[PDB]
Amino acid sequence: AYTNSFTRGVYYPDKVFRSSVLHS
Amino acid sequence: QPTNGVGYQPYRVVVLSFELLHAPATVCGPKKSTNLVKNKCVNFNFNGLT
Amino acid sequence: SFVIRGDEVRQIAPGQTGKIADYNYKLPDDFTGCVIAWNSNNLDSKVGGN
Amino acid sequence: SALGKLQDVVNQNAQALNTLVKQLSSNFGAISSVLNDILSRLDKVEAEVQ
Amino acid sequence: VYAWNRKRISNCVADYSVLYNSASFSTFKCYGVSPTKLNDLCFTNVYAD
Secondary structure: OOOOOOOOOOOOOOOOOOOOOOOO | OOOOOHHHOOOOOOOEEEEOOOOOOOEEOOOOOOOOOOOOOOOOOEOOEO | OOOOOHHHHHHOOOOOOOHHHHHOOOOOOOOOOOOOOOOOHHHHOOOOOO | OOOHHHHHHHHHHHHHHHHHHHOOOOOOOOOOOOHHHHHHHOOHHHHOOO | OOOOOOEEEOOEEOOOHHHHOOOOOOOOOOOOOOOOOHHHOEEOEEEEO
């Protein structure tokens, strides 16, 4: 059997603080 | 063999590979810390980040 | 004009470091000039040492 | 949406300043885009090329 | 060299001046750093191969 992941499994890509911003 | 010319003599090699990631330090140079002066402008160095 | 051992000849250039470059003879970074050197074991060496 | 001509002028000036700031992050073929990395890692003859 | 050794160096203070000023070395080339400058730096990890 299977299930849809939706938008799960995201994590902080580096140990850097960023705020009020969009980062690619 | 000790009869060999230098191109055919043995050499020992060490390669030091370094990384300073988007993450903290664990190896540092011999350099010594000094007092944290907050609320003034300072020339600074944190873990080698000048 | 001066005498050094063969390994130290690399230190006689602008922007170098080491015992000769830093404590004996320092070139400026904008050095304009020729460095000329030759092995002198036939003149500058003696038994038990010069 | 009626004032689209005036909002378009504001948006184009903001897009041009954001592009100018984001180009500070580009390496341009240097070892880092952070000018303090180059200066804290390299000596003058190497650093000036970066 | 086909099965070269590696040592993790971590959680310690180095002094690379003791290395690069030694007469023992026939070649000492650095990439992305200056040999004179290493005593001013810190690193997340060091690997000695």
